[PDB]
Amino acid sequence: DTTAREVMTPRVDVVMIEDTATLESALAIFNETGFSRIPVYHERIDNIVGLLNVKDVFSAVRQQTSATIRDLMYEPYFIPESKKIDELLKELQVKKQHMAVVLDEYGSFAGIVTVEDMLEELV
Amino acid sequence: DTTAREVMTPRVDVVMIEDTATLESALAIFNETGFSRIPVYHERIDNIVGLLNVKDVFSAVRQQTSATIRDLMYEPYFIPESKKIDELLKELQVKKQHMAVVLDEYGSFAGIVTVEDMLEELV
Ligand SMILES: Nc1ncnc2c1ncn2[C@@H]1O[C@H](COP(=O)(O)OP(=O)(O)OP(=O)(O)O)[C@@H](O)[C@H]1O
Ligand SMILES: Nc1ncnc2c1ncn2[C@@H]1O[C@H](COP(=O)(O)OP(=O)(O)OP(=O)(O)O)[C@@H](O)[C@H]1O
Ligand SMILES: [Mg+2]
Ligand SMILES: [Mg+2]
Ligand SMILES: [Mg+2]
Ligand SMILES: [Mg+2]
Protein backbone atom coordinates (compact mmCIF):
# COMPACT_ATOMS: atom_id res chain seq x y z
CA ASP A 1 0.00 0.00 0.00
CA THR A 2 3.03 2.26 -0.42
CA THR A 3 2.26 5.69 -1.87
CA ALA A 4 4.11 8.10 -4.15
CA ARG A 5 5.07 10.48 -1.33
CA GLU A 6 6.90 7.66 0.47
CA VAL A 7 9.30 7.06 -2.45
CA MET A 8 9.37 10.44 -4.21
CA THR A 9 12.31 12.78 -4.55
CA PRO A 10 10.95 15.88 -2.76
CA ARG A 11 10.69 19.27 -4.45
CA VAL A 12 13.55 20.66 -2.38
CA ASP A 13 15.94 18.19 -4.06
CA VAL A 14 14.64 18.50 -7.64
CA VAL A 15 16.77 20.03 -10.38
CA MET A 16 14.48 22.23 -12.49
CA ILE A 17 14.71 24.89 -15.19
CA GLU A 18 12.58 27.88 -16.13
CA ASP A 19 10.86 27.89 -19.52
CA THR A 20 12.61 31.21 -20.27
CA ALA A 21 16.07 29.62 -20.06
CA THR A 22 18.23 28.90 -23.09
CA LEU A 23 19.01 25.43 -24.40
CA GLU A 24 22.68 26.11 -23.65
CA SER A 25 21.79 26.60 -19.98
CA ALA A 26 19.79 23.36 -20.05
CA LEU A 27 22.76 21.44 -21.47
CA ALA A 28 24.91 22.82 -18.65
CA ILE A 29 22.34 21.70 -16.07
CA PHE A 30 22.12 18.22 -17.60
CA ASN A 31 25.91 17.88 -17.67
CA GLU A 32 26.55 19.06 -14.11
CA THR A 33 23.79 16.97 -12.52
CA GLY A 34 23.74 13.93 -14.81
CA PHE A 35 19.95 13.60 -14.84
CA SER A 36 18.15 12.77 -18.08
CA ARG A 37 14.93 14.66 -17.29
CA ILE A 38 14.37 17.95 -15.46
CA PRO A 39 10.96 19.58 -14.84
CA VAL A 40 10.19 22.93 -16.46
CA TYR A 41 8.44 25.66 -14.47
CA HIS A 42 6.83 28.94 -15.52
CA GLU A 43 7.42 31.95 -13.24
CA ARG A 44 6.93 29.98 -10.01
CA ILE A 45 8.55 26.71 -8.97
CA ASP A 46 5.11 25.30 -8.12
CA ASN A 47 3.86 25.89 -11.69
CA ILE A 48 5.27 22.85 -13.50
CA VAL A 49 4.39 23.19 -17.19
CA GLY A 50 6.49 20.42 -18.75
CA LEU A 51 9.42 18.03 -18.62
CA LEU A 52 12.64 18.43 -20.61
CA ASN A 53 14.57 15.42 -21.90
CA VAL A 54 18.30 15.79 -22.54
CA LYS A 55 17.84 13.85 -25.79
CA ASP A 56 15.55 16.48 -27.33
CA VAL A 57 18.01 19.19 -26.25
CA PHE A 58 21.05 17.48 -27.78
CA SER A 59 19.26 16.58 -31.02
CA ALA A 60 18.27 20.24 -31.46
CA VAL A 61 21.93 21.32 -31.72
CA ARG A 62 19.47 18.24 -36.02
CA GLN A 63 20.62 21.84 -36.44
CA GLN A 64 20.68 25.14 -34.57
CA THR A 65 17.17 26.58 -34.78
CA SER A 66 14.73 28.84 -32.92
CA ALA A 67 13.87 26.02 -30.51
CA THR A 68 12.52 27.13 -27.12
CA ILE A 69 12.10 24.93 -24.06
CA ARG A 70 8.34 25.36 -24.44
CA ASP A 71 8.67 23.64 -27.83
CA LEU A 72 10.91 20.78 -26.67
CA MET A 73 9.12 20.10 -23.37
CA TYR A 74 6.35 17.51 -23.10
CA GLU A 75 3.37 17.17 -20.79
CA PRO A 76 4.07 15.54 -17.41
CA TYR A 77 1.93 12.88 -15.77
CA PHE A 78 0.62 14.49 -12.58
CA ILE A 79 -0.39 12.32 -9.62
CA PRO A 80 -1.42 12.86 -6.00
CA GLU A 81 0.79 12.06 -3.03
CA SER A 82 -1.67 9.30 -2.09
CA LYS A 83 -1.23 7.46 -5.40
CA LYS A 84 -0.29 3.83 -4.77
CA ILE A 85 2.94 2.96 -6.56
CA ASP A 86 1.63 -0.43 -7.73
CA GLU A 87 -0.88 1.48 -9.86
CA LEU A 88 1.66 4.13 -10.89
CA LEU A 89 4.19 1.54 -12.09
CA LYS A 90 1.65 0.02 -14.48
CA GLU A 91 0.39 3.43 -15.61
CA LEU A 92 3.91 4.65 -16.43
CA GLN A 93 4.56 1.41 -18.31
CA VAL A 94 1.52 1.94 -20.55
CA LYS A 95 2.65 5.50 -21.30
CA LYS A 96 6.31 4.46 -21.72
CA GLN A 97 7.19 7.36 -19.41
CA HIS A 98 9.92 7.31 -16.76
CA MET A 99 8.92 10.22 -14.50
CA ALA A 100 5.74 11.39 -12.78
CA VAL A 101 5.17 14.71 -10.99
CA VAL A 102 3.62 14.52 -7.52
CA LEU A 103 1.24 17.26 -6.39
CA ASP A 104 0.05 18.14 -2.89
CA GLU A 105 -3.44 18.88 -1.57
CA TYR A 106 -3.21 22.41 -3.05
CA GLY A 107 -2.24 21.19 -6.52
CA SER A 108 1.31 22.52 -6.10
CA PHE A 109 4.64 20.85 -6.79
CA ALA A 110 5.45 18.23 -4.14
CA GLY A 111 8.12 16.12 -5.84
CA ILE A 112 8.85 13.54 -8.52
CA VAL A 113 8.70 9.75 -8.78
CA THR A 114 10.63 7.75 -11.38
CA VAL A 115 10.49 4.03 -12.09
CA GLU A 116 13.81 3.71 -10.27
CA ASP A 117 12.24 5.23 -7.15
CA MET A 118 9.48 2.61 -7.15
CA LEU A 119 11.81 -0.29 -7.94
CA GLU A 120 14.12 0.78 -5.10
CA GLU A 121 11.44 -0.57 -2.76
CA LEU A 122 12.16 -4.10 -4.03
CA VAL A 123 15.73 -4.04 -2.77
CA ASP B 1 8.74 -18.13 -13.42
CA THR B 2 9.12 -16.08 -16.60
CA THR B 3 12.64 -16.04 -18.05
CA ALA B 4 14.72 -13.48 -19.93
CA ARG B 5 14.29 -15.18 -23.31
CA GLU B 6 10.51 -14.83 -23.04
CA VAL B 7 10.65 -11.02 -22.81
CA MET B 8 13.91 -10.18 -24.58
CA THR B 9 14.34 -8.26 -27.80
CA PRO B 10 16.07 -10.90 -29.97
CA ARG B 11 19.45 -10.34 -31.58
CA VAL B 12 17.90 -10.07 -35.04
CA ASP B 13 16.07 -6.89 -33.95
CA VAL B 14 18.93 -5.25 -32.01
CA VAL B 15 20.54 -2.04 -33.23
CA MET B 16 24.29 -2.39 -32.66
CA ILE B 17 27.53 -0.66 -33.64
CA GLU B 18 31.08 -1.84 -34.19
CA ASP B 19 33.81 -0.58 -31.88
CA THR B 20 35.69 0.69 -34.95
CA ALA B 21 32.89 3.11 -35.86
CA THR B 22 33.13 6.86 -35.36
CA LEU B 23 31.15 8.82 -32.79
CA GLU B 24 29.49 10.68 -35.67
CA SER B 25 28.15 7.37 -36.98
CA ALA B 26 26.91 6.51 -33.48
CA LEU B 27 25.04 9.82 -33.22
CA ALA B 28 23.38 9.06 -36.56
CA ILE B 29 22.34 5.62 -35.32
CA PHE B 30 20.94 7.05 -32.08
CA ASN B 31 19.00 9.73 -33.97
CA GLU B 32 17.48 7.44 -36.61
CA THR B 33 16.43 4.70 -34.17
CA GLY B 34 15.69 6.74 -31.04
CA PHE B 35 17.22 4.23 -28.63
CA SER B 36 19.33 5.45 -25.72
CA ARG B 37 21.66 2.43 -25.55
CA ILE B 38 23.11 0.27 -28.34
CA PRO B 39 25.45 -2.72 -27.82
CA VAL B 40 29.00 -2.55 -29.15
CA TYR B 41 30.54 -5.55 -30.91
CA HIS B 42 34.12 -6.35 -31.93
CA GLU B 43 34.60 -8.00 -35.33
CA ARG B 44 31.64 -10.39 -34.94
CA ILE B 45 28.07 -9.58 -33.92
CA ASP B 46 28.22 -12.34 -31.29
CA ASN B 47 31.23 -10.70 -29.57
CA ILE B 48 29.54 -8.02 -27.47
CA VAL B 49 32.27 -6.01 -25.74
CA GLY B 50 30.31 -3.07 -24.32
CA LEU B 51 27.26 -0.84 -24.32
CA LEU B 52 27.17 2.73 -25.65
CA ASN B 53 24.96 5.39 -24.06
CA VAL B 54 23.86 8.34 -26.20
CA LYS B 55 24.61 10.63 -23.24
CA ASP B 56 28.32 9.82 -23.22
CA VAL B 57 28.42 10.34 -26.99
CA PHE B 58 26.72 13.74 -26.89
CA SER B 59 28.77 14.98 -23.93
CA ALA B 60 31.97 14.12 -25.82
CA VAL B 61 31.17 16.64 -28.58
CA ARG B 62 32.65 18.49 -23.24
CA GLN B 63 34.82 19.07 -26.32
CA GLN B 64 35.97 17.31 -29.47
CA THR B 65 38.69 14.87 -28.43
CA SER B 66 40.29 11.56 -29.41
CA ALA B 67 37.40 9.63 -27.86
CA THR B 68 36.85 6.13 -29.23
CA ILE B 69 33.81 3.94 -28.64
CA ARG B 70 36.05 1.59 -26.65
CA ASP B 71 36.66 4.49 -24.26
CA LEU B 72 33.02 5.59 -23.93
CA MET B 73 31.50 2.09 -23.74
CA TYR B 74 30.87 0.37 -20.41
CA GLU B 75 30.70 -3.27 -19.40
CA PRO B 76 27.34 -5.00 -19.97
CA TYR B 77 25.59 -7.27 -17.49
CA PHE B 78 25.47 -10.68 -19.17
CA ILE B 79 22.78 -13.20 -18.22
CA PRO B 80 21.56 -16.57 -19.47
CA GLU B 81 18.31 -17.09 -21.34
CA SER B 82 17.03 -19.06 -18.33
CA LYS B 83 17.46 -16.12 -15.94
CA LYS B 84 14.20 -15.43 -14.11
CA ILE B 85 13.13 -11.82 -14.60
CA ASP B 86 12.10 -11.40 -10.95
CA GLU B 87 15.77 -11.84 -10.05
CA LEU B 88 16.98 -9.73 -12.99
CA LEU B 89 14.73 -6.80 -12.09
CA LYS B 90 16.23 -6.60 -8.60
CA GLU B 91 19.78 -7.11 -9.88
CA LEU B 92 19.45 -4.30 -12.43
CA GLN B 93 18.01 -2.05 -9.72
CA VAL B 94 21.05 -2.58 -7.48
CA LYS B 95 23.38 -1.77 -10.39
CA LYS B 96 21.22 1.17 -11.55
CA GLN B 97 21.47 -0.30 -15.07
CA HIS B 98 18.67 -0.34 -17.64
CA MET B 99 19.83 -3.06 -20.06
CA ALA B 100 21.11 -6.62 -19.78
CA VAL B 101 22.62 -8.75 -22.55
CA VAL B 102 21.23 -12.27 -22.92
CA LEU B 103 23.55 -15.10 -23.99
CA ASP B 104 22.71 -18.54 -25.35
CA GLU B 105 24.08 -21.97 -24.42
CA TYR B 106 27.21 -21.24 -26.50
CA GLY B 107 27.90 -17.92 -24.79
CA SER B 108 26.94 -15.99 -27.93
CA PHE B 109 24.65 -12.99 -28.35
CA ALA B 110 20.99 -13.98 -27.98
CA GLY B 111 19.28 -10.65 -27.30
CA ILE B 112 18.72 -7.87 -24.79
CA VAL B 113 16.35 -7.25 -21.88
CA THR B 114 15.58 -3.79 -20.50
CA VAL B 115 13.52 -2.85 -17.46
CA GLU B 116 10.73 -1.86 -19.84
CA ASP B 117 10.72 -5.38 -21.29
CA MET B 118 10.21 -6.90 -17.84
CA LEU B 119 7.61 -4.34 -16.76
CA GLU B 120 5.66 -4.96 -19.98
CA GLU B 121 4.64 -8.28 -18.41
CA LEU B 122 2.63 -6.38 -15.78
CA VAL B 123 0.30 -4.87 -18.36
N1 LIG C 1 15.66 16.26 -12.31
C1 LIG C 1 15.84 15.53 -11.21
N2 LIG C 1 16.07 16.17 -10.04
C2 LIG C 1 16.25 15.45 -8.93
N3 LIG C 1 16.22 14.13 -8.79
C3 LIG C 1 15.99 13.52 -9.95
C4 LIG C 1 15.79 14.12 -11.18
N4 LIG C 1 15.58 13.18 -12.17
C5 LIG C 1 15.66 12.04 -11.53
N5 LIG C 1 15.91 12.17 -10.18
C6 LIG C 1 16.04 11.10 -9.20
O1 LIG C 1 17.19 10.36 -9.55
C7 LIG C 1 17.01 8.98 -9.15
C8 LIG C 1 17.20 8.14 -10.39
O2 LIG C 1 16.12 8.38 -11.31
P1 LIG C 1 16.22 7.92 -12.82
O3 LIG C 1 17.05 6.71 -12.95
O4 LIG C 1 14.81 7.82 -13.40
O5 LIG C 1 16.93 9.17 -13.51
P2 LIG C 1 18.18 9.41 -14.46
O6 LIG C 1 19.40 8.75 -13.95
O7 LIG C 1 18.28 10.92 -14.71
O8 LIG C 1 17.69 8.74 -15.81
P3 LIG C 1 18.03 7.49 -16.74
O9 LIG C 1 18.59 6.38 -15.92
O10 LIG C 1 16.70 7.15 -17.42
O11 LIG C 1 19.01 8.04 -17.77
C9 LIG C 1 15.57 8.89 -8.64
O12 LIG C 1 15.64 9.20 -7.26
C10 LIG C 1 14.91 10.09 -9.30
O13 LIG C 1 13.94 10.57 -8.38
N1 LIG D 1 19.58 -0.88 -29.11
C1 LIG D 1 18.37 -1.45 -29.13
N2 LIG D 1 18.04 -2.22 -30.19
C2 LIG D 1 16.84 -2.80 -30.21
N3 LIG D 1 15.86 -2.74 -29.30
C3 LIG D 1 16.22 -1.97 -28.27
C4 LIG D 1 17.42 -1.31 -28.10
N4 LIG D 1 17.44 -0.61 -26.91
C5 LIG D 1 16.26 -0.86 -26.39
N5 LIG D 1 15.47 -1.67 -27.16
C6 LIG D 1 14.12 -2.14 -26.86
O1 LIG D 1 13.29 -1.01 -26.84
C7 LIG D 1 12.20 -1.22 -25.91
C8 LIG D 1 12.25 -0.08 -24.92
O2 LIG D 1 13.44 -0.19 -24.11
P1 LIG D 1 13.94 1.03 -23.23
O3 LIG D 1 12.80 1.86 -22.77
O4 LIG D 1 14.85 0.50 -22.13
O5 LIG D 1 14.85 1.83 -24.25
P2 LIG D 1 14.98 3.33 -24.76
O6 LIG D 1 13.68 3.88 -25.19
O7 LIG D 1 16.10 3.37 -25.80
O8 LIG D 1 15.51 4.06 -23.46
P3 LIG D 1 15.03 5.14 -22.39
O9 LIG D 1 13.55 5.09 -22.23
O10 LIG D 1 15.80 4.77 -21.11
O11 LIG D 1 15.55 6.48 -22.93
C9 LIG D 1 12.52 -2.55 -25.22
O12 LIG D 1 11.91 -3.55 -26.04
C10 LIG D 1 14.02 -2.70 -25.45
O13 LIG D 1 14.27 -4.09 -25.61
MG1 LIG E 1 12.20 3.95 -23.42
MG1 LIG F 1 1.84 17.06 3.18
MG1 LIG G 1 19.12 6.46 -13.86
MG1 LIG H 1 17.70 -21.54 -28.01
Residue numbers in the entry:
A (entry chain A), B (entry chain A): 199 to 259, 261 to 322
What does the paper say about this structure?
CNNM/CorB proteins are a broadly conserved family of integral membrane proteins with close to 90,000 protein sequences known. Structurally, CNNM/CorB proteins are defined by a conserved core consisting of a transmembrane domain (TMD) and a cytosolic cystathionine-β-synthase (CBS)-pair domain. Here, we determine the crystal structure of an archaeal CorB ortholog in two distinct conformations (apo and Mg2+-ATP-bound).
MtCorB with a C-terminal CorC domain deletion (MtCorBΔC) purified in DDM yielded crystals in presence of Mg2+-ATP. However, upon structural elucidation, the unit cell only contained the soluble CBS-pair domain. The isolated MtCorBCBS structure from the in situ cleavage of MtCorBΔC allowed us to visualize the detailed interactions of Mg2+-ATP binding at higher resolution. As observed in the structure with the TMD, two molecules of Mg2+-ATP are bound to the central cavity of the CBS-pair dimer. The adenine bases are sandwiched between Phe233 and Ile311 in a hydrophobic pocket comprising Met298, Phe237, Ile236, Val212, and Val213. The ATP ribose forms hydrogen bonds with the side chains of Thr207, Asp316, and Thr313. The phosphate groups are stabilized with Arg235 and Ser234 with the bound Mg2+ coordinated in an octahedral arrangement with three phosphates and three water molecules. Initial phases were determined by molecular replacement using MtCNNMCBS structure solved earlier, which represented 40% of the crystallized construct (residues 199–322).
